[PDB]
Design a protein around this ligand. Structure first.
Ligand code: CL
Ligand code: CL
Ligand code: CL
Ligand code: CL
Ligand code: CL
Ligand code: CL
Ligand code: CL
Ligand code: MG
Length: 268
């Protein structure tokens, strides 16, 4: 294809909302004892060897949480054409800066040492995270500007200013979140990102802090579209991001610049 990184069939509303994409997937377990730098995890990967190499992401949980809290993202994203590494942290009490470093240590294990490293294009990587792990994605993106995408889900971080981030970032907030309220976390994060950066804010209507821990089609479709657009440079997914979505039962607020790779809109 024109885009060497394009994978899978042309997307539709149905395909980006489905619980699975078109790629068969498998898993590998990485034990705590096999790695240094992070708490092990689970690799979800496309099994096909005829489609080319894939981009990859690491995903981190929040304070006290285990990888089971984010596991549903594994098959859901991997089956759309990504290697997805859901990790445990060294301790459940690790703070956002530590989670950020562990996201990066996990990506380096994935691309340099893991059993699927040959299936990955190590130049096309991203980070996703929930809660303090979402705070970790901003920490990781700030440190590693070569990342292609960063997605904090209901993120928590005492640092509110992210004006040096150069990684395209989708900030996902939960409107009713009382643990990491959007007014003091997600929205400040989004507002402090550079005006020149490809970025978006997605607010889940009436959602709690725990919405990212259960199957959620709105989180899935926009996470997928963002990862496709920026890890794969896949302009077939631009249609779902630009013009920005209108508010709905699932979406209470959306902000972002359009078009990508080139003005800011906001729907409330
Ligand atoms: Cl539609
Ligand atoms: Cl459709
Ligand atoms: Cl491995
Ligand atoms: Cl870098
Ligand atoms: Cl700050
Ligand atoms: Cl809450
Ligand atoms: Cl909708
Ligand atoms: Mg890119």
């Amino acid at each position: 294809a024109e885009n060497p990184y394009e994978r899978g069939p042309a997307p539709t509303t149905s395909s980006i909302e489905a619980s699975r994409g078109s790629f068969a997937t498998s898993t590998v377990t990485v034990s705590r004892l096999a790695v240094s730098g992070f708490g092990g995890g689970t690799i979800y990967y496309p099994t096909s060897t005829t489609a080319g190499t894939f981009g990859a992401i690491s995903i981190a949980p929040g304070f006290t949480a285990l990888q089971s809290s984010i596991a549903w993202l594994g098959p859901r994203l991997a089956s759309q054409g990504f290697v997805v590494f859901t990790i445990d942290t060294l301790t459940t009490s690790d703070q956002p800066d530590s989670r950020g470093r562990q996201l990066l240590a996990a990506l380096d294990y994935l691309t340099q040492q893991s059993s699927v490293r040959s299936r990955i294009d190590s130049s096309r990587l991203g980070v996703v995270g929930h809660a303090m792990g979402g705070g970790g994605t901003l920490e990781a993106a700030r440190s590693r500007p070569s990342l292609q995408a960063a997605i904090p889900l209901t993120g928590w971080n005492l640092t509110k200013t992210w004006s040096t981030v150069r990684v395209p970032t989708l900030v996902v907030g939960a409107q009713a979140d009382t643990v990491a309220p959007v007014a003091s976390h997600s929205i400040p994060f989004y507002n402090s990102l550079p005006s020149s950066l490809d970025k978006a804010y997605l607010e889940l209507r009436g959602a709690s802090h725990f919405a990212p821990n259960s199957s959620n089609t709105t989180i899935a479709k926009y996470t997928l579209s963002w990862l496709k657009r920026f890890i794969d440079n896949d302009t077939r997914y631009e249609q779902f991001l630009c013009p920005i979505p209108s508010t709905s039962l699932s979406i209470s607020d959306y902000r972002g610049n359009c078009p990508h790779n080139g003005x800011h809109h906001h729907h409330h």
